[PDB]
Amino acid sequence: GPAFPGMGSEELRLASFYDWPLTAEVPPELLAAAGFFHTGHQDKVRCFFCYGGLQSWKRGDDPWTEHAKWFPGCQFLLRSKGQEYINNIH
Ligand X SMILES: CN[C@@H](C)C(=O)N[C@H](C(=O)N1CCC[C@H]1c1nc2c(-c3ccccc3)cccc2s1)C1CCCCC1
Query: What residues line the site for ligand X (CB under 6 A)?
Result: 39, 44, 46, 53-58, 61, 66, 70
Residue from 31, 45, 47, 54 in contact with Zn ion (CB under 5 A): 47
3-state secondary structure of 36: strand
Site for Zn ion contains 48 (CB under 5 A): no
Contact (Cβ atoms closer than 8 angstroms) between residue 52 and residue 74? yes
Task: With CB under 5 A as the rule, give the number of residues binding Zn ion.
Answer: 5
Rg, Å, the chain Cα set: 12
Q: Which residues bind Zn ion (CB under 5 A)?
A: 47, 49-50, 71, 74
